[PDB]
Symmetry: D2
Subunit: 115 residues, 4 copies
């Protein structure tokens, strides 16, 4: 898969397990079209979101459902979701890892891009 | 000043100056509607975005135009922007500071809610 | 005020109040020697740590007692402290703000150097 | 190995390759005793630092050589090194991943602890 998402929990020191991740791709009419979705595993990783054939160039938005995650842990979350927006494959196909580190009132995200 | 935005640059260790910031409030039809906007000052701060009367409870999105900031510096960015989506709840006297720390391929955001 | 320390809490979305901060300067015998210290205020800030005359170029270490902070809140922490080690270089008029964002199993630190 | 270190570069969007990592363990006389060391691989990971037999309870300090990393990339670093200090195995053996995300004037670190 050319697009992996990894999510970590900064409160418990663990991977963020069973976190819903939605990926959208910007359409011609400037609206967000559903592209792919899934849940993080026991390792906090989400593999198999897409394939090389489906992952075309475009502007993508990765929405991480942090609200449900904190609510299920009984913690009061600030953010509705963690939203990462970027242009992908504009200079040819690349592999992307989008990582996110979550806290109730803060999040950090980084990207690892390889050719 | 119930809502302030502060933006910092992790590459040069400075405030991020003249960065466009747009604030949206979630409408009844599940759409993002413009609420406030401005450009960060020499201190990387954006004050006077809204008034106590205008800033009601609801779901807000703060979009920071980080792509334009890195491009002006001649540094290649990954993200289109940094978007912070959160619920604003009236739970006593509160002031919100949304702070973002930027790098070309990463960003962190936090909220500081004070009385 | 050539050196300021600001500490934020990512769990409760607030300044981190009454946190002990110790500043050390690297000696000629490669040892860490005490330089300044204090406790963060109600705003999570610690001002008046040093004077322009005292704050010379060199290698500094800022140690934030995060373990005592989380323990007082009844939250289990991972780190003993958060230590920020950096070189202070005179390159025109400069003020250093060392900011730290804390979670029980994570921390982020940045420096804001302003003229 | 019960202790893994992963390091990422927030400027280039890549793993931080060939970064020196030194691990110390606090001795009875309050001094830092060398414990283990190594360099991150092409994936930014450092495996095989230690073994279950050698990794006893104690206070450990993981020092990441960020200064050499930025200097070799021709970037001006602020920090001398990224220092992560924590008590390990105090309630029995655990597996620890210490991750760090690097920028020239900032770093973030988190821990993933598993039983
Ligand atoms: O309210 C202020 O003046 C003020 C100052 C310094 C600040 N630093 C931050 C900050 C630091 C890190 Cl390490 C990560 C993140 Cl996400 C944010 O938020 C701030 C606010
Ligand atoms: O254990 C792994 O393989 C692995 C992978 C990707 C990872 N990304 C991070 C990371 C991300 C952010 Cl946004 C902030 C911080 Cl402090 C750390 O930790 C990781 C670990």
């Amino acid at each position: 898969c050319p697009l992996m998402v990894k999510v970590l929990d900064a409160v418990r020191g663990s991977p963020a397990i069973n976190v819903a991740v939605h990926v959208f791709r910007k359409a011609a009419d400037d609206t967000w079209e559903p592209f792919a979705s899934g849940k993080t595993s026991e390792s906090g990783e989400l593999h198999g979101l897409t394939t090389e054939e489906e992952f075309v160039e475009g502007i993508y938005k990765v929405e991480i459902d942090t609200k449900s995650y904190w609510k299920a842990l009984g913690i009061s979350p600030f953010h509705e979701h963690a939203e990462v927006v970027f242009t992908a494959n504009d200079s040819g196909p690349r592999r992307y890892t989008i990582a996110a580190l979550l806290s109730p009132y803060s999040y950090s995200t980084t990207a690892v891009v390889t050719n």
